[PDB]
Design a protein around this ligand. Sequence first.
Ligand SMILES: [Cl-]
Ligand SMILES: [Cl-]
Ligand code: NA
Length: 129
Amino acid sequence: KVFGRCELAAAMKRHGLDNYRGYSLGNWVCAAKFESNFNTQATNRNTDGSTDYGILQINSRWWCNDGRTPGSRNLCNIPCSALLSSDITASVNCAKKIVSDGNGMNAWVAWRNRCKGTDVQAWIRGCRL
Ligand SMILES: [Cl-]
Ligand SMILES: [Cl-]
Ligand code: NA
């Protein structure tokens, strides 16, 4: 599923991400835009052989099991394919674990390089929340 901007904001709002660990909703919408262009089915292979999955591009080296990242962890205790669903629940629940692990949203390279320190509130402007 390719979400619309305000549609995603509302779904993320409905799943507890607004101000989760102090990150306002616009931060999460901005991160999803530049990580996956709002597409739940996005995948990308990394040099080390791990793969990033879903709307927030969660990596198989630590967070999910895809059966082909030897020596990896599965800290969210899920198959990586669950992160490609049109239901974003699994992605949101895993993202909450990631952002709590000490490094905040710096775990998302696109957030660090394209959202951090910008007017992120613009990503939810005009939406009805
Ligand atoms: Cl915001
Ligand atoms: Cl933080
Ligand atoms: Na893994």
